[PDB]
Design a protein around this ligand. Structure first.
Ligand code: HEC
Length: 80
């Protein structure tokens, strides 16, 4: 929803249409669509991190469960 992206700290480097540090959620959903692994793939870089798709900025790992992480990839996609 929204309170799940604040208490955690994902909005720190993200935002619907507020290009700041990380890739705004909106842009993240546009990068994928119809993929058969957009949930495991996204949530994958969510519970681990990495870089190379948005530049060289190496994103840090996060401490989230595969459940809330799955809701962040399914919710981020539902966002235009
Ligand atoms: C800044 C210190 C960040 C914090 C804190 C979080 N994320 Fe992040 N995220 C960041 C960057 C720089 C990137 C892009 C990697 C790069 O090339 O630099 C990302 C990317 C994501 C993605 C998409 C990755 C993909 O497969 O394209 C997701 C889904 C994502 N981030 C989720 C996420 C969540 C849930 C966070 C809170 C726990 C979070 N990020 C924090 C930078 C930063």
């Amino acid at each position: 929803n929204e309170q799940l992206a604040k208490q955690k700290g994902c909005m720190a480097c993200h935002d619907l249409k507020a290009k700041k540090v990380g890739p705004a959620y909106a842009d993240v959903a546009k990068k994928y669509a119809g993929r058969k692994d957009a949930v495991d793939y996204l949530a994958g870089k969510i519970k681990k991190g990495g870089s190379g798709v948005w530049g060289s900025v190496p994103m840090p790992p996060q401490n989230v469960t595969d459940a809330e992480a799955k809701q962040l990839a399914q919710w981020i996609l539902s966002i235009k």
